mmCIF file of all heavy atoms in Angstrom:
data_model
loop_
_atom_site.group_PDB
_atom_site.id
_atom_site.type_symbol
_atom_site.label_atom_id
_atom_site.label_comp_id
_atom_site.label_asym_id
_atom_site.label_seq_id
_atom_site.Cartn_x
_atom_site.Cartn_y
_atom_site.Cartn_z
ATOM 1 N N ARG A 12 30.151 5.015 4.578
ATOM 2 C CA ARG A 12 30.829 4.717 3.398
ATOM 3 C C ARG A 12 32.168 4.175 3.578
ATOM 4 O O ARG A 12 32.598 3.281 2.846
ATOM 5 C CB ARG A 12 31.014 5.998 2.541
ATOM 6 C CG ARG A 12 31.798 5.891 1.255
ATOM 7 C CD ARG A 12 32.578 7.148 1.001
ATOM 8 N NE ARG A 12 31.750 8.174 0.285
ATOM 9 C CZ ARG A 12 31.467 9.319 0.779
ATOM 10 N NH1 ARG A 12 31.924 9.733 1.923
ATOM 11 N NH2 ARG A 12 30.711 10.192 0.079
ATOM 12 N N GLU A 13 32.906 4.649 4.620
ATOM 13 C CA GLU A 13 34.292 4.180 4.798
ATOM 14 C C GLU A 13 34.648 4.181 6.293
ATOM 15 O O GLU A 13 34.398 5.195 7.000
ATOM 16 C CB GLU A 13 35.251 5.119 4.058
ATOM 17 C CG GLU A 13 36.659 4.535 3.910
ATOM 18 C CD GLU A 13 37.686 5.446 3.348
ATOM 19 O OE1 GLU A 13 37.263 6.581 2.907
ATOM 20 O OE2 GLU A 13 38.850 5.113 3.425
ATOM 21 N N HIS A 14 35.237 3.131 6.746
ATOM 22 C CA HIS A 14 35.751 2.971 8.109
ATOM 23 C C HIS A 14 37.133 3.667 8.216
ATOM 24 O O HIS A 14 38.050 3.228 7.506
ATOM 25 C CB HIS A 14 35.873 1.551 8.522
ATOM 26 C CG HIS A 14 34.470 0.888 8.804
ATOM 27 N ND1 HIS A 14 34.266 -0.422 8.462
ATOM 28 C CD2 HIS A 14 33.360 1.402 9.339
ATOM 29 C CE1 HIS A 14 33.018 -0.699 8.751
ATOM 30 N NE2 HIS A 14 32.448 0.309 9.352
ATOM 31 N N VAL A 15 37.225 4.611 9.108
ATOM 32 C CA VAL A 15 38.433 5.464 9.272
ATOM 33 C C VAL A 15 38.718 5.473 10.735
ATOM 34 O O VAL A 15 37.891 5.931 11.559
ATOM 35 C CB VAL A 15 38.182 6.864 8.707
ATOM 36 C CG1 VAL A 15 39.390 7.701 9.060
ATOM 37 C CG2 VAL A 15 37.947 6.776 7.204
ATOM 38 N N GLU A 16 39.917 4.957 11.140
ATOM 39 C CA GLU A 16 40.263 4.900 12.560
ATOM 40 C C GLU A 16 40.716 6.287 13.083
ATOM 41 O O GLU A 16 40.913 7.233 12.251
ATOM 42 C CB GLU A 16 41.359 3.869 12.780
ATOM 43 C CG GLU A 16 41.089 2.575 12.123
ATOM 44 C CD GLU A 16 40.816 1.420 13.105
ATOM 45 O OE1 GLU A 16 40.545 1.751 14.282
ATOM 46 O OE2 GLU A 16 40.915 0.283 12.671
ATOM 47 N N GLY A 17 40.808 6.388 14.324
ATOM 48 C CA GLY A 17 41.186 7.628 14.977
ATOM 49 C C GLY A 17 40.168 8.711 14.868
ATOM 50 O O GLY A 17 38.953 8.509 14.843
ATOM 51 N N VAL A 18 40.618 9.979 14.813
ATOM 52 C CA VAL A 18 39.728 11.119 14.710
ATOM 53 C C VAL A 18 38.959 11.048 13.406
ATOM 54 O O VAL A 18 39.589 11.013 12.301
ATOM 55 C CB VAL A 18 40.519 12.469 14.851
ATOM 56 C CG1 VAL A 18 39.516 13.625 14.568
ATOM 57 C CG2 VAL A 18 41.111 12.588 16.259
ATOM 58 N N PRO A 19 37.707 11.091 13.438
ATOM 59 C CA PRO A 19 36.878 10.951 12.239
ATOM 60 C C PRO A 19 37.103 12.200 11.317
ATOM 61 O O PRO A 19 37.142 13.312 11.723
ATOM 62 C CB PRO A 19 35.406 10.946 12.711
ATOM 63 C CG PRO A 19 35.471 10.514 14.182
ATOM 64 C CD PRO A 19 36.773 11.125 14.650
ATOM 65 N N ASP A 20 37.196 11.901 9.993
ATOM 66 C CA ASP A 20 36.914 12.868 8.903
ATOM 67 C C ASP A 20 35.471 12.506 8.420
ATOM 68 O O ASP A 20 35.279 11.673 7.584
ATOM 69 C CB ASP A 20 37.973 12.700 7.840
ATOM 70 C CG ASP A 20 37.705 13.649 6.591
ATOM 71 O OD1 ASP A 20 36.794 14.498 6.729
ATOM 72 O OD2 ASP A 20 38.368 13.463 5.621
ATOM 73 N N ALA A 21 34.507 13.325 8.947
ATOM 74 C CA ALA A 21 33.072 12.978 8.675
ATOM 75 C C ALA A 21 32.770 13.076 7.179
ATOM 76 O O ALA A 21 31.975 12.190 6.685
ATOM 77 C CB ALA A 21 32.171 13.867 9.510
ATOM 78 N N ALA A 22 33.285 14.041 6.484
ATOM 79 C CA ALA A 22 33.008 14.201 5.053
ATOM 80 C C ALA A 22 33.477 13.012 4.236
ATOM 81 O O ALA A 22 32.912 12.847 3.116
ATOM 82 C CB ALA A 22 33.689 15.492 4.531
ATOM 83 N N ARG A 23 34.453 12.242 4.737
ATOM 84 C CA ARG A 23 34.929 11.079 4.037
ATOM 85 C C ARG A 23 34.156 9.778 4.462
ATOM 86 O O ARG A 23 34.010 8.866 3.704
ATOM 87 C CB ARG A 23 36.388 10.896 4.287
ATOM 88 C CG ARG A 23 37.054 9.718 3.721
ATOM 89 C CD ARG A 23 38.462 9.546 4.266
ATOM 90 N NE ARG A 23 39.138 8.305 3.891
ATOM 91 C CZ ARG A 23 40.409 7.973 4.384
ATOM 92 N NH1 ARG A 23 41.089 8.798 5.172
ATOM 93 N NH2 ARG A 23 40.855 6.799 4.047
ATOM 94 N N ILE A 24 33.694 9.794 5.768
ATOM 95 C CA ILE A 24 33.102 8.564 6.337
ATOM 96 C C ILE A 24 31.695 8.361 5.973
ATOM 97 O O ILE A 24 31.147 7.284 5.892
ATOM 98 C CB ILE A 24 33.274 8.740 7.834
ATOM 99 C CG1 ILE A 24 34.732 8.531 8.271
ATOM 100 C CG2 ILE A 24 32.323 7.664 8.592
ATOM 101 C CD1 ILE A 24 34.932 8.853 9.775
ATOM 102 N N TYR A 25 31.009 9.536 5.698
ATOM 103 C CA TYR A 25 29.531 9.549 5.586
ATOM 104 C C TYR A 25 29.118 10.006 4.240
ATOM 105 O O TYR A 25 29.739 10.905 3.675
ATOM 106 C CB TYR A 25 28.846 10.377 6.640
ATOM 107 C CG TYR A 25 29.178 9.852 8.081
ATOM 108 C CD1 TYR A 25 29.975 10.620 8.954
ATOM 109 C CD2 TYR A 25 28.610 8.675 8.513
ATOM 110 C CE1 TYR A 25 30.217 10.154 10.234
ATOM 111 C CE2 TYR A 25 28.888 8.193 9.772
ATOM 112 C CZ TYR A 25 29.690 8.947 10.643
ATOM 113 O OH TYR A 25 29.971 8.500 11.937
#
Side-chain angles (χ1 to χ4, degrees):
Chain A
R12 174 214 276 120
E13 194 187 352
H14 289 141
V15 172
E16 312 247 17
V18 173
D20 175 12
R23 174 191 174 185
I24 290 168
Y25 299 111

